[PDB]
Design a protein around this nucleic acid. Structure first.
Ligand code: SF4
Ligand code: CA
Ligand code: CA
Length: 355
DNA sequence: AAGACGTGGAC
DNA sequence: GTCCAAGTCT
């Protein structure tokens, strides 16, 4: 970027950003902990989604030390519905590491900060530049799109050769006077003007520096690979109540998909032997007798890498003794306390409507 | 590496 | 209905 007017670019970009900067709860100060929380929440989650989640999370957990001293089940419930739940398990372990090894002080050296769980190349850049003014690039989806258009990068943005190149661009053009504002400005440009479809080049403050605008190839950039079809997984789900009114739920294991979350009992059903497969599964628990009615709904629930096809079977349960872990009976009132994945919150809504 | 890992805003 | 978001794990 020898022929690039970095200083002219920075002036127009930072002048735009001051005018159009959105009022977001994590922009009210530069507390390293609060910045870190917002940036983790923001990973692969849109700003408008994150806003109410951040507001409530910081209410329950106002300080790094409050999050460290808290129980993992309360931490998980405060993320309920946001998706990619290991972010919060990672964040929770990381803040414990900071309380121990670092005296509660978020490290300001990138190598030490990046070593914390949950902190990748994007989050090192975003937290350190905002909270401490470290000139580290914060290259997210927004930035990759903007830079591939400004500088006509035609290579798949998923390659490391391309990532290293975006990083090297940011180090050349960044305003080392205010690296936090520079990083948040490039992102904000990608979010509000230089958008994935139909970018607003005519309202763009840096139109005169953009190579894709000049060549008329903006909407063809960035280069990303089309998504390949994902496996469909049939799943039978039982909503079982008893004479007293309590419902049978169970806690998922701590490894893999939707870990440590609660669900209604379920099982894979290649074919349509779900009424049978469920009865065989519930009865295999100690002193548990069960009889299920016909299904009441079937809906899909999408994950990034697979798609669940849920069928809900109501039923009733008789227990001759204590229900063995991982299972548990819960009155309908106590359900709102447990953390459920979105799929199973909908299972429950469809069962209450049916009744 | 590759693939696992959630959900919904914004068209 | 489709894309992709203020990505990271190891
Ligand atoms: S002129 Fe258009 S393509 Fe170029 S940076 Fe601005 S919005 Fe993006
Ligand atoms: Ca790291
Ligand atoms: Ca498991």
């Amino acid at each position: 970027t020898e022929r690039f007017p970095a200083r002219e670019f920075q002036r127009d970009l930072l002048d735009w950003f001051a005018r159009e900067r959105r009022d977001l709860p994590w922009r009210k100060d530069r507390d390293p902990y609060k910045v870190w929380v917002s940036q983790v929440m923001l990973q692969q989650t849109r700003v408008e989604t994150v806003i109410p989640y951040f507001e409530q999370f910081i209410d329950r957990f106002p300080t790094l030390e409050a999050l460290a001293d808290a129980d993992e089940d309360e931490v998980l419930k405060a993320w309920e519905g946001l998706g990619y739940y290991s972010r919060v398990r990672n964040l929770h372990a990381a803040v414990k590491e900071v309380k121990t090894r670092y005296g509660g002080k978020v490290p300001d050296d990138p190598d030490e900060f990046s070593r914390l769980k949950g902190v990748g190349p994007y989050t090192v850049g975003a937290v350190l530049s905002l909270a401490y003014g470290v000139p580290e690039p914060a290259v997210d989806g927004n930035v990759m799109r903007v830079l591939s258009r400004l500088f006509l990068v035609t290579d798949d943005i998923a390659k490391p050769s391309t990532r290293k190149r975006f990083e090297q661009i940011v180090r050349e053009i960044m305003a080392y006077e205010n690296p936090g504002a520079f990083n948040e400005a490039l992102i904000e440009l990608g979010a509000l003007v230089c958008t994935p479809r139909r970018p607003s080049c005519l309202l763009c403050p840096v139109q005169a520096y953009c190579q894709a605008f000049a060549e008329g190839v903006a909407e063809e950039l960035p280069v990303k690979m089309k998504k390949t079809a994902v496996k469909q997984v049939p799943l039978a789900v039982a909503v079982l109540a008893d004479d007293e009114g309590r419902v049978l739920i169970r806690k998922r294991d701590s490894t893999g998909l939707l870990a440590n979350l609660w669900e209604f009992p379920s099982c894979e059903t290649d074919g349509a032997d779900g009424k049978e497969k469920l009865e065989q599964m519930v009865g295999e628990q100690y002193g548990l007798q069960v009889e299920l009615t016909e299904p009441i709904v079937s809906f899909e629930h999408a994950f990034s890498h697979l798609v669940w096809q849920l069928t809900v079977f109501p039923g009733r349960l008789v227990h001759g003794g204590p229900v063995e872990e991982p299972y548990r009976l819960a009155p309908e009132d106590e359900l709102k306390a447990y953390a459920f994945p979105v799929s199973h919150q909908r299972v429950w809504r469809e069962y209450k409507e049916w009744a």
